[PDB]
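User: Predict the structure for this protein chain, please.
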Amino acid sequence: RPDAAGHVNIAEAVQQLNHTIVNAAHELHETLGLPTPDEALNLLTEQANAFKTKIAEVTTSLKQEAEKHQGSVAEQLNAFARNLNNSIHDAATSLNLQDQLNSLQSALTNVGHQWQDIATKTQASAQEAWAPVQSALQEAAEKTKEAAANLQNSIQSAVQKPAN
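Assistant: Here is the predicted structure, written as structure tokens:
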């Protein structure tokens, strides 16, 4: 199909970021074995703490658009943006030697699942639906993606450093 009829664009566009977060999310469990089944949390926690606050800056970019005019329709999306601050607030806080990796994959994936919600609304409106979010999501997907690159970079750089 040609881009799925044509209304599909944000779900397909954001999908490019999903390939990144899913990679680092799976690498987090792979790096956990590199050092030990406990101390490894330090490598993930140190990196996850940067991505946790980084989303706070990216999520604000979405609600920031509602402080000019989008706020009318954005009001429903404002509930989706705040959910990210709640997911990151408790993404790297549970350090019970299991919540770090479990919360990281659920946290990094949370932004991917939450974006899927609005990515679908474009199918309903199509013309105006993406217009206001295109600037907030396109500018947030690039900033959140940059955080995933540096995040996986440590996990991939720490696992490749020793190599067997």
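The chain has five helices and no strands.
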